[PDB]
Amino acid sequence: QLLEQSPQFLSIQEGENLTVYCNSSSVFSSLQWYRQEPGEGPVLLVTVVTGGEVKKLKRLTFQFGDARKDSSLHITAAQPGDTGLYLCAGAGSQGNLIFGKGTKLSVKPNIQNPDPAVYQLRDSKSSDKSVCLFTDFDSQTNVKDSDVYITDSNSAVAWSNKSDFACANAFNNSIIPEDTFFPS
């Protein structure tokens, strides 16, 4: 009927633990959890069947609530490879299987000696357009129109087909940290 998943998005450092949730308006006979990579098929992680059931599969721990309307998925020591969309699915005696919208998890690889910096690179063929590269920033960094273009691991790139496009503009009001190396 209604399957809700929380949080919708989660960005975390490698090494962090996390818990995500599946909440239902109605009782389920069973509930399944899946992980999906972009443009790939969801992979089944678990089925839970009994109210109160806890299943530990290695770094992943699942619980089905006593009332069979809620489920948690917990990851211990998250790894870059855990990145993906975690899907919840179930049915309950109406027997209409229903899919949640998912939690999109992004795990940022460790960076033990950060060196946040913004660089400007030139085109090989030198039409002399450039891109801006923001790199070597830690996990507590989060990355004015559809023209200025951006791509968010530990690096982000920005580009634009305007001439007043400066790298200082593309990466600021944003979240470059305090000691970012920013060469001319």
Partner: protein, 240 residues
């Protein structure tokens, strides 16, 4: 255990398309879903046993057959008004909802074959300031202006593909994200040691495989037909 083919599908509106799903797990039940960015997975059709099918919530404009245990073909007809989506097939045991999914197929449908454009591809050379700061050198590849968003990017150095140091965007991004009618871009980074970049005998190539028009598609325009094709750009080592 489950095959969908092909990975990418491009069609003009009004043209029926049949998506294949074949299964060797000896499962009775088979399923079709569509996946849209704001929705997760929605059931199109469910077939619990050979010859049995039940419509999902969005079967409007879709058709399926199930004459064999091992195959579940999906036809997308002209009556589906929003057919662009990622389509996933799955199978399960008869008395279960524990599913095993195929790899999925990206279908894109367009008003006009003239709306297809292959990527332009450019490689941006490592910053000398990065090199002196970190002793590392990041190359950036940009593929831009393409439609449909059906591309695969790879990096090749001295003619051999590499994976170490590569970080590619998981999916193409709309250049006009706030709007329906948009072309796509994709970026990728290759990071190597400065010493490796500074060797002029090292040749770095960004290669983008585009999936576009097929040779049974007709084309009358002056510009080169936007067929499935590879587009590449290079930057060579610089001993600065």
């Amino acid at each position: 255990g489950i095959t969908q083919s092909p990975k990418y599908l491009f069609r003009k509106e009004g043209q029926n398309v049949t998506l294949s799903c074949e299964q060797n797990l000896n499962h009775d039940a088979m399923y079709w879903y569509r996946q849209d960015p704001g929705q997760g997975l929605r059931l199109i059709y469910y077939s619990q046993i050979v010859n049995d099918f039940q419509k999902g919530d969005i079967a409007e404009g879709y058709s399926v057959s199930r004459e064999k245990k091992e195959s579940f073909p999906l036809t997308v007809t002209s009556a589906q008004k929003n057919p662009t989506a990622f389509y996933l097939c799955a199978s399960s045991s008869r008395s279960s909802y524990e599913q095993y999914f195929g790899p999925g197929t990206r279908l894109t449908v367009t008003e006009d074959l003239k709306n297809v454009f292959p990527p332009e591809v450019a490689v941006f050379e490592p910053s000398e300031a990065e090199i002196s700061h970190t002793q590392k050198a990041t190359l950036v590849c940009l593929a831009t202006g393409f439609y449909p968003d059906h591309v695969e990017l790879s990096w090749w150095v001295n003619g051999k593909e590499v994976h170490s140091g590569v970080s590619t965007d998981p999916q193409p991004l709309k250049e006009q994200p706030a709007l329906n009618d948009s072309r796509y871009s994709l970026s990728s980074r290759l990071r190597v040691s400065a010493t490796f970049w500074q060797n002029p005998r090292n040749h770095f190539r960004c290669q983008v495989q585009f999936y576009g028009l097929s040779e049974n598609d007709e084309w009358t325009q002056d510009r080169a037909k936007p067929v499935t094709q590879i587009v590449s750009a290079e930057a060579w080592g610089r001993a600065d």
